[PDB]
Design an enzyme around this catalytic site. Sequence first.
Site, PDB file in Angstrom:
ATOM      1  N   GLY A   1       0.792  -1.225   0.000  1.00  0.00           N
ATOM      2  CA  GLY A   1       0.000   0.000   0.000  1.00  0.00           C
ATOM      3  C   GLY A   1       0.819   1.267   0.000  1.00  0.00           C
TER       4      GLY A   1
ATOM      5  N   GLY B   1       2.306   8.021  -1.712  1.00  0.00           N
ATOM      6  CA  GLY B   1       2.323   9.479  -1.610  1.00  0.00           C
ATOM      7  C   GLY B   1       2.973  10.040  -0.361  1.00  0.00           C
ATOM      8  N   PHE B   2       2.319   9.851   0.800  1.00  0.00           N
ATOM      9  CA  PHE B   2       2.823  10.317   2.094  1.00  0.00           C
ATOM     10  C   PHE B   2       3.802   9.303   2.701  1.00  0.00           C
TER      11      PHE B   2
ATOM     12  N   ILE C   1       3.704   1.207   2.447  1.00  0.00           N
ATOM     13  CA  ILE C   1       3.442   0.117   3.397  1.00  0.00           C
ATOM     14  C   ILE C   1       3.870  -1.183   2.763  1.00  0.00           C
ATOM     15  CG2 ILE C   1       1.662  -1.038   4.847  1.00  0.00           C
ATOM     16  CD1 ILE C   1       0.295   1.962   3.959  1.00  0.00           C
TER      17      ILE C   1
ATOM     18  N   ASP D   1     -10.750   8.952   7.978  1.00  0.00           N
ATOM     19  CA  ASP D   1     -10.814   8.235   6.706  1.00  0.00           C
ATOM     20  C   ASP D   1     -11.386   6.871   6.925  1.00  0.00           C
ATOM     21  OD1 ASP D   1     -10.728   7.961   3.891  1.00  0.00           O
ATOM     22  OD2 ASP D   1      -8.603   7.524   3.829  1.00  0.00           O
TER      23      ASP D   1
HETATM   24  C1  LIG Z   1      -5.581   0.965   2.456  1.00  0.00           C
HETATM   25  C2  LIG Z   1      -4.702   1.286   3.691  1.00  0.00           C
HETATM   26  N1  LIG Z   1      -5.071   2.674   4.180  1.00  0.00           N
HETATM   27  C3  LIG Z   1      -4.929   0.243   4.786  1.00  0.00           C
HETATM   28  C4  LIG Z   1      -4.359  -1.111   4.394  1.00  0.00           C
HETATM   29  N2  LIG Z   1      -2.916  -1.028   4.141  1.00  0.00           N
HETATM   30  C5  LIG Z   1      -2.360  -2.349   3.815  1.00  0.00           C
HETATM   31  C6  LIG Z   1      -2.583  -3.404   4.862  1.00  0.00           C
HETATM   32  C7  LIG Z   1      -3.065  -4.712   4.564  1.00  0.00           C
HETATM   33  C8  LIG Z   1      -3.089  -5.458   5.691  1.00  0.00           C
HETATM   34  N3  LIG Z   1      -2.611  -4.639   6.735  1.00  0.00           N
HETATM   35  N4  LIG Z   1      -2.461  -4.962   8.055  1.00  0.00           N
HETATM   36  C9  LIG Z   1      -2.008  -3.956   8.818  1.00  0.00           C
HETATM   37  N5  LIG Z   1      -1.690  -2.715   8.428  1.00  0.00           N
HETATM   38  C10 LIG Z   1      -1.849  -2.420   7.143  1.00  0.00           C
HETATM   39  N6  LIG Z   1      -1.596  -1.140   6.757  1.00  0.00           N
HETATM   40  C11 LIG Z   1      -0.873  -0.179   7.482  1.00  0.00           C
HETATM   41  C12 LIG Z   1      -1.313   1.140   7.519  1.00  0.00           C
HETATM   42  C13 LIG Z   1      -0.626   2.066   8.282  1.00  0.00           C
HETATM   43  O1  LIG Z   1      -1.042   3.367   8.222  1.00  0.00           O
HETATM   44  C14 LIG Z   1       0.489   1.690   9.022  1.00  0.00           C
HETATM   45  C15 LIG Z   1       0.919   0.375   8.946  1.00  0.00           C
HETATM   46 BR1  LIG Z   1       2.485  -0.169   9.886  1.00  0.00          BR
HETATM   47  C16 LIG Z   1       0.266  -0.559   8.182  1.00  0.00           C
HETATM   48  C17 LIG Z   1      -2.314  -3.357   6.194  1.00  0.00           C
HETATM   49  C18 LIG Z   1      -2.689  -0.102   3.024  1.00  0.00           C
HETATM   50  C19 LIG Z   1      -3.206   1.287   3.348  1.00  0.00           C
END
Ligand SMILES: CC1(N)CCN(Cc2ccn3ncnc(Nc4cc(O)cc(Br)c4)c23)CC1
Length: 293
Positions: free
Chosen positions: A20, A23-24, A27, A133
Amino acid sequence: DILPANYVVKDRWKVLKKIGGGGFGEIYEAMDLLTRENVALKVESAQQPKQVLKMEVAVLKKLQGKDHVCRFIGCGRNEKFNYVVMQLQGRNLADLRRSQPRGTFTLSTTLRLGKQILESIEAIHSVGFLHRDIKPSNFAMGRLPSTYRKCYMLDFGLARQYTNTTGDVRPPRNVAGFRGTVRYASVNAHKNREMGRHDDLWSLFYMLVEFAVGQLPWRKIKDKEQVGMIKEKYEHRMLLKHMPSEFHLFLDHIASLDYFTKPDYQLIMSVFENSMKERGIAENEAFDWEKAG
Ligand SMILES: CC1(N)CCN(Cc2ccn3ncnc(Nc4cc(O)cc(Br)c4)c23)CC1
């Protein structure tokens, strides 16, 4: 990409793939070389003018102990990037809903997810932050025998503290350009007004209608202003035609709130619990994506 595959953070977290962002911050799914499970790792450039990771870690740490929150694993800062590592979750509600035959969840699944999501919203508000969000891709089901029926709130990158140091509500700014996803933003957010606790509850309301009906009227209308004008002129009671009747109390309650006022979370929880009781919906039921009866 800030980090390539096989990059090892702090001699412990080995990057597997990007999952994921961009931009900012970005992940990744990473291998924890100590505990041997996979984890989620978010990184942001140390040179970035707008840095949110320090605030995002602060919210995550404040929520430890609450249900629907990922376990905090680690964080750090160096000359190239800042990072946070947290428990990795599974399938998100946007993907799970689209995988359903008619792109809808049953009312059983919709209401039980609504209760879990409401709990997580009250939890982040209790520690003084707005999520800002709330959307289906920010809610994921667990990936373990101990968590696969638990829904987790993800991503505090757009969060904002709504209190001062002494628990009082901070003054709203005179204008606040809304940051959240267009589809689920409240009319107040569309007007570029400072968001309050009620605006996260408006996002929940739209998600639940989308889950049960399969769509919102403004889906695939991409223009921010046009979507806000549709929501401003749309009779929200028309959205409730095929929803449980107690959702009118939920709508009336959140429509009455302002930036300052604490929501009546118990009123909304009762809407979901009473709607389930009336239909004989129990917590032990299979979710729609679970098979064998
Ligand atoms: C679509 C979104 N917004 C939320 C999902 N992530 C992908 C995703 C898929 C499964 N998981 N499990 C834990 N944390 C995640 N994201 C995450 C987000 C944060 O802000 C910080 C961290 Br560390 C991990 C994640 C992409 C950005």
